[PDB]
Amino acid sequence: LMGGFGLKHPPPQILIKNTPVPADPPTTFNQSKLNSFITQYSTGQVSVEIEWELQKENSKRWNPEIQYTSNYYKSTSVDFAVNTEGVYSEPRPIGTRYLTRNL
Amino acid sequence: LMGGFGLKHPPPQILIKNTPVPADPPTTFNQSKLNSFITQYSTGQVSVEIEWELQKENSKRWNPEIQYTSNYYKSTSVDFAVNTEGVYSEPRPIGTRYLTRNL
Amino acid sequence: LMGGFGLKHPPPQILIKNTPVPADPPTTFNQSKLNSFITQYSTGQVSVEIEWELQKENSKRWNPEIQYTSNYYKSTSVDFAVNTEGVYSEPRPIGTRYLTRNL
Secondary structure (H helix, E strand, O other), rough: OOOOOOOOOOOOOOOOOOOOOOOOOOOOOOOOOOOOOOOOOOOOOOOOOOOOOOOOOOOOOOOOOOOOOOOOOOOOOOOOOOOOOOOOOOOOOOOHHHHHHOO | OOOOOOHHHHOOOOOOOOOOOOOOOOOOOOOOOOOOOOOOOOOOOOOOOOOOOOOOOOOOOOOOOOOOOOOOOOOOOOOOOOOOOOOOOOOOOOOOOOOOOOO | OOOOOOOOOOOOOOOOOOOEEEEEOOOOOOOOOOOOEEOOOOOOOOOOOOOOOOOOOOOOOOOOOOOOOOOOEEEOOOOOOOOOOOOOOOOOOOOOOOOOOOO
């Protein structure tokens, strides 16, 4: 309902965790689980590749269609770009449905 | 200068004419060229096929481009279509230069 | 106009950057982009090799030509060399056009 493709078998969840590294244990045995750990974080890069299959338009419509277009006139900043402060923003929502087809 | 492609050897001129059909000539010889002709016109169909080669866009531009689009809002008649009177008209001039490229 | 060789396809730009390494993130999730990073710089060596093709002189001129020459007489320091302070300097501009050729 929110939109999208519904799959019985969707891309699987990928779960990541830092393995625990204990701080020094006591020198005489205690059965309680360890609660003292070294403090850690991790950083890395991640890549996703997707192949999409397209369906081309086959229209016999004579006149031009509606198209998404960037604004013609001057503006303080560029839409879909950064700030003077380095903040990316997306100005509007963009849908998918510009071309037309008969029923 | 008006625009277009300039060719040393452009598509050749194609010339068409109705052949003359004389009305009845005089029954005794006269040397003067005939000036009496049957009245004729012709009609037919003509076909042109052209193959155009395209150059595709290779842009790395992040934000959307300008595009020619048909008007979004309601109107008395459809642009690039006929009248109630059957007259086709082209409402605006359309150029070629919407996408962008660096220098 | 500043001089040199003009190429449709010149040596490509080479871009280098240090990958970001985050400082420790917060322990409960926040959606905002990370703004705390470890401080880093990098150093290395870089090599360029170029092959140049030369055009040799073919002159029938009897008398000697002009040539770029280093100065004959004594001087406080050597031209195109370092300081007592270790600063390299280039004393004059050197052009390319000493030999002669007819028109």
